[PDB]
Amino acid sequence: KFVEKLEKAIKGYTFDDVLLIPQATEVEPKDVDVSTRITPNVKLNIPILSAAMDTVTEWEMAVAMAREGGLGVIHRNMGIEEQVEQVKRVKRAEKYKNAVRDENGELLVAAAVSPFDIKRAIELDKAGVDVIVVDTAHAHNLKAIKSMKEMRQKVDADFIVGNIANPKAVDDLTFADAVKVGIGPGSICTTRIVAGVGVPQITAVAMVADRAQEYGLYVIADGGIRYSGDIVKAIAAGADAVMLGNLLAGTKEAPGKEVIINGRKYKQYRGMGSLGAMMKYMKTRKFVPEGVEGVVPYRGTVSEVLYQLVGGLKAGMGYVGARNIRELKEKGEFVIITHAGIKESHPHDIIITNEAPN
Amino acid sequence: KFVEKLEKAIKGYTFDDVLLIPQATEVEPKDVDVSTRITPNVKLNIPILSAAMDTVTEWEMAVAMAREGGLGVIHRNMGIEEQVEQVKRVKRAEKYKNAVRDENGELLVAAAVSPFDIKRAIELDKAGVDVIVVDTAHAHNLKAIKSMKEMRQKVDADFIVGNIANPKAVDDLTFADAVKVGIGPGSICTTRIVAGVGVPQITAVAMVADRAQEYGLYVIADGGIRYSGDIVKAIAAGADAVMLGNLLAGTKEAPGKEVIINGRKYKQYRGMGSLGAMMKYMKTRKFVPEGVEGVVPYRGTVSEVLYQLVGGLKAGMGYVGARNIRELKEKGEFVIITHAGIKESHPHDIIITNEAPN
Amino acid sequence: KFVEKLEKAIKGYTFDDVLLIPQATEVEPKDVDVSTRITPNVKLNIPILSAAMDTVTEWEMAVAMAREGGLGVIHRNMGIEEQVEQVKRVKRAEKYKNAVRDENGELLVAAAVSPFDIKRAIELDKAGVDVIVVDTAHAHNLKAIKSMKEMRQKVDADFIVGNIANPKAVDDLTFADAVKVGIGPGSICTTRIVAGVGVPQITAVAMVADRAQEYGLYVIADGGIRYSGDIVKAIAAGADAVMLGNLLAGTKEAPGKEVIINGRKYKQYRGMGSLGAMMKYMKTRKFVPEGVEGVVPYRGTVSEVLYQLVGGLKAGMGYVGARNIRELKEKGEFVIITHAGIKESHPHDIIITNEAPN
Amino acid sequence: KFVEKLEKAIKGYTFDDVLLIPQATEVEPKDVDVSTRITPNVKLNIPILSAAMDTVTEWEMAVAMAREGGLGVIHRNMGIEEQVEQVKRVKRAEKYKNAVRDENGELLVAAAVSPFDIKRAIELDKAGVDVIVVDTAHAHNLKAIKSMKEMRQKVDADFIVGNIANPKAVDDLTFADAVKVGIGPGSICTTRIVAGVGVPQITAVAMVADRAQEYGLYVIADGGIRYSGDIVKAIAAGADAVMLGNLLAGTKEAPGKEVIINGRKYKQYRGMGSLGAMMKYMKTRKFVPEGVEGVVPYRGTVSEVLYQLVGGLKAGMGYVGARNIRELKEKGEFVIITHAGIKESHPHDIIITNEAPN
Numbered sequence A, B, C, D: 001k002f003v004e005k006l007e008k009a010i011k012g013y014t015f016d017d018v019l020l021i022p023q024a025t026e027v028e029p030k031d032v033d034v035s036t037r038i039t040p041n042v043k044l045n046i047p048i049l050s051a052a053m054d055t056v057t058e059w060e061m062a063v064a065m066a067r068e069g070g071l072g073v074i075h076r077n078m079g080i081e082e083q084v085e086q087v088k089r090v091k092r093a094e095k096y097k098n099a100v101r102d103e104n105g106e107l108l109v110a111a112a113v114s115p116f117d118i119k120r121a122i123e124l125d126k127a128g129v130d131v132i133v134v135d136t137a138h139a140h141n142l143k144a145i146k147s148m149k150e151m152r153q154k155v156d157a158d159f160i161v162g163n164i165a166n167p168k169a170v171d172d173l174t175f176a177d178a179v180k181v182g183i184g185p186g187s188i189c190t191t192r193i194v195a196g197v198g199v200p201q202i203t204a205v206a207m208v209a210d211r212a213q214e215y216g217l218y219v220i221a222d223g224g225i226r227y228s229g230d231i232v233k234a235i236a237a238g239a240d241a242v243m244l245g246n247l248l249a250g251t252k253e254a255p256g257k258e259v260i261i262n263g264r265k266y267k268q269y270r271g272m273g274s275l276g277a278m279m280k281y282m283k284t285r286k287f288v289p290e291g292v293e294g295v296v297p298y299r300g301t302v303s304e305v306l307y308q309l310v311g312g313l314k315a316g317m318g319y320v321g322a323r324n325i326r327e328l329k330e331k332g333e334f335v336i337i338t339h340a341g342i343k344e345s346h347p348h349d350i351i352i353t354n355e356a357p358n
């Protein structure tokens, strides 16, 4: 019985365990289309959402994301009235040819809510939020799901529930428009260390994506993205879009506090499940933290970060012969590599003097 | 023949090689029950025992452990009369709703003895010890086992023999109430380096647990636990409880000497098979040490450490839908991960400023 | 579908994942012949080409390479007239018994061109270049290949197209004399990090070599070579020759700028896809860099570096009983090793005071 | 063809990839017998030989080794007359109950020779050397083997040829008494880096041992031993004895020059295939070095080192229920472990203050 648990254990892979195999390419890469659909009513011009964290997304980030064709999810570590005001400021913010707007030409915006905060949801919905993101650590909670269903029935906005890491969870969330995948891969996440629970992101996305495709739900890969190359892999693994925390934290638009150390600029970045975040409107029913607090170097503007990420994604799509997202998901093939392969993949046997992305 | 040894070699896994897969959860996590049975007459309120080491468990630790629902095993690197006095002080120590007590309302306590120290055992038994723990490096020793049987017949207390790492050893220990698993995983253990013998803990627990279940014996996972997440994995692998050395060392109650270095507080922690421990009542028939001496940072009180560990265990059980220990052992499923997966599981690509567990 | 991508994923190996198994040897090693054919009209006396990079190969490097029996590929990050002049200076440069010369006794030389630069190619061809090397990041580009075919028809020089990492690409390049293998292994390469695309070099060379052999095309392993041992492995994996960047950079003949740091000598080495290289005649249609800038320690003269590399290759060939290149490719057998095996393969448990290669 | 080389590649294991599984033990460990036979006329009281290196074995080391029941192999980086004198001094050196002596009560001694130095061999034989050790990097050399056969016919001493790493080599060396296994694992060895050739030691010993057993030849595992635990594994893998360089270097008896750095004592240790060793009577037909030069910390006397090593071996044998060497080779079973398992096997999550072996 216990030995069979080990013998039958599935083998899980993360971003660094795989590489995409180059293929014949007819069109690339400057002509690559990266638009993608995440909900019945929402198609982004770039497959990127900014995390719903208090050191990542507030109104400024959301405006910047929407102007670039992406989407910002206003965090919920604030009062309901404060969150509705953030949403309104974004919707009325409008040179940005890639911007994603609603029927009235207003920038799109999303906002996070707890599975039980139906009041908050309705207020956000009335404020004109385009997407409601049920933001929980383990969405496959029955009681929570019952509350989610009631919530879905009382709002018009599109509905995204996350996070999950087991395909079986999709079967009980078919009332949502999309599911967010990611349990334990976050840069500031300690859930796997504290709880011992999780699934390597590439494997998690693939398992969930196959099940989601069966029900008509979209998939968002959340957490663990460190390089543009990870985005290409996530999409090839089945995701329609990715959600970034670390890579967007430290940008001018990020609400994280500035920090200088040794003359170098940084910005705070912390898990919403950290003491600091808890010491700020959520009160989780958790006895111990599952996130840490840290800092990331100053990255410049959101615009500059997205240009690099999207640039890399387009290069990767060109290399595999994918003219659009659907084709990447369709024909992207993987090769599994070893630790030594990981080392050779990064720059090696050299004293780097400049790694600039321009 | 020799090549077949390699071809037929079993693949062994340790804590970091696996993760638990999230599942549908109906009740969690603050309502999770972590009580567990380790012997016919002993059920703990938390699945944790403090190691029988001279830098970990003496009367103060044992009192603190029992008051929290756990169990302390008084070490045997002292005289018989000194050990009986430690036991008595614990039994008469009694605001602690989770405390584990015997029929007379006295805190429970355990004590270690050598497989050959029948005299010590009888004295401990008369002093009212609740559990006698035969404490040896390799319990699957025939001569030792013969002595153990005679010992079991002369004491009333429950009987725990360890340590072992091969299921075949259980077959010859069916006269005991439970077996302790762990050969080589300890934080200060060098047995695998000095002797070249051992079995990765997750695999060892699983193999032994399947065999133990066939005979009605309980299983305790001893050594190698560094995080609360490891506890969840050990139990899911077949263990009824775990034994901690490193994580309890450095607490206020631990008998280890205090040490200050660079203004920072530490406490000594060393293997019982180290020169220091040997230079203190045991005299092993070993030519060379199989343990080292070191220090661990000050952790605070036992109460604070247990709260965190149990907190993590409850979070993990909630994530897999386990309302109690039996269900964790019953339905916990694993996913095997690579080194890259291990890296992504811990916090990464961030300059940590705070990892506090509150 | 997505899960099958992972289940059917091929396992890729790089240089450090393998070792060659020693065999009975009748002749070795000072009598080992390392000559090798890379094109219908070109056989080198040593299986080594210098990279077409602006910090590696200009006329001096090319002269040194040809004098030792190797081949230099003049980089294309300069004007057409400048490149033709570099070529002419090499052809007229002529104590060097291993030198490779053309029919008129002139040192051989190669030059790189973009798949679309037919003008540059014709000029190089008229200048007497022996080999034209189509130098692109992803040669399996249809539009590029159409241009390549027109180019092949307008020049007399031998034709080498690269780089590729998929055997399927060979099928569409049968009009060339040889293909260059290598996508992502370079010491200063970030293509796998930025685009997420690539194939571990040993696996890439083997897959391509089997397909190339079917069409009569030669194979050159480009990138990732750090030690002479890697050369032996690359050839045993199917390559006819290797191309070096890092190992030749830092030599007296390399055009890289000199840099002193802490009294120690270095020379600049950077990817052609780096800002620095771009800031120098190419203008790629890439949005972001896929190479970095760094420095390598001063290595001495090209002659000294080649002696060591070739020395190692000959030792390795002797150990496997290969009197020539054809036999190495023919009978070289591999054993796959683990990370621990990699550690034991390098010097260990010692404080090195001298690693000199004389 | 090339892809099949990878698909059919055998998987090789080194010491750190495996652990021995504990078993029922009837007698251990102070009653463990570690005597072992390495040749028809030579049985050692401990399975250890000192390397034939100029920084490891000269007459003092050989005397110390024989007095402890082991064997010293006088290195050949000296003149013939100097080597014969070293041998004589050992034979006439004679409180040492474990000493290994010949028929006349003289300490045993071995000496190394090149496969072609028949003159040196005969002189050593006449001087009374007990074992002649043909000392070469790749013994599976036909020309060398022909010379070896002539040598075997002109000496009375027992004959040991090494090193090899392929079982096929044993088939051509059946005229010898034993073969020495080890190509590339040495602490100061770079053969695998320079030549790309080698076989992980555990796998090499096992493959060779199975073939050797078929012909009646003994096996000596040479190189890569860092801990007593490695000795237990090597023997369990099929070896009759092991040869140590690094672990014996740095002892009082070792001829290596003393070196002080930061108040700490060290002794030089270098490969015989290093410039330093070459700059000292061998003149190899190698173009480049395959060994490095370094230093090891002062270890104390040979006696103290052997006590620890043998102590560990006995502990390991007790843990697996082996009362003697034959039984270890007979019933020792392995479990393969991962990198994480390797980490847990060593001391972890502790600040070591003392690792003393007493």
Ligand SMILES: O=c1[nH]c(=O)c2[nH+]cn([C@@H]3O[C@H](COP(=O)(O)O)[C@@H](O)[C@H]3O)c2[nH]1
Residues within 6 Å of the ligand: A051, A052, A053, A184, A185, A186, A187, A188, A189, A190, A191, A222, A223, A224, A225, A243, A244, A245, A246, A247, A270, A271, A272, A273, A274, A290, A291, A292
């Ligand atoms: O287990 C967790 N404990 C936390 O405290 C925490 N905070 C954020 N997150 C999630 O991490 C995602 C961002 O991941 P990255 O920084 O790698 O982009 C985000 O999308 C969040 O989903 C957490 N997960």
Ligand SMILES: O=c1[nH]c(=O)c2[nH+]cn([C@@H]3O[C@H](COP(=O)(O)O)[C@@H](O)[C@H]3O)c2[nH]1
Residues within 6 Å of the ligand: B051, B052, B053, B184, B185, B186, B187, B188, B189, B190, B191, B222, B223, B224, B225, B243, B244, B245, B246, B247, B270, B271, B272, B273, B274, B290, B291, B292
């Ligand atoms: O091989 C060993 N040599 C030793 O000297 C030694 N000292 C303690 N122990 C065992 O390690 C366990 C505690 O392990 P942790 O520190 O990882 O919690 C404890 O439960 C002890 O079983 C030893 N094992």
Ligand SMILES: O=c1[nH]c(=O)c2[nH+]cn([C@@H]3O[C@H](COP(=O)(O)O)[C@@H](O)[C@H]3O)c2[nH]1
Residues within 6 Å of the ligand: C051, C052, C053, C184, C185, C186, C187, C188, C189, C190, C191, C222, C223, C224, C225, C243, C244, C245, C246, C247, C270, C271, C272, C273, C274, C290, C291, C292
């Ligand atoms: O992806 C890349 N981005 C770059 O900027 C770049 N620059 C050079 N190269 C290629 O790397 C090869 C040299 O590799 P080594 O330094 O390891 O010898 C060379 O042969 C080049 O093919 C690049 N690849």
Ligand SMILES: O=c1[nH]c(=O)c2[nH+]cn([C@@H]3O[C@H](COP(=O)(O)O)[C@@H](O)[C@H]3O)c2[nH]1
Residues within 6 Å of the ligand: D051, D052, D053, D184, D185, D186, D187, D188, D189, D190, D191, D222, D223, D224, D225, D243, D244, D245, D246, D247, D270, D271, D272, D273, D274, D290, D291, D292
């Ligand atoms: O490839 C090699 N190049 C060298 O220069 C060299 N020097 C010593 N040896 C061999 O290494 C063995 C000692 O290995 P350890 O230091 O790990 O005990 C010894 O037994 C020697 O066989 C060499 N191998």
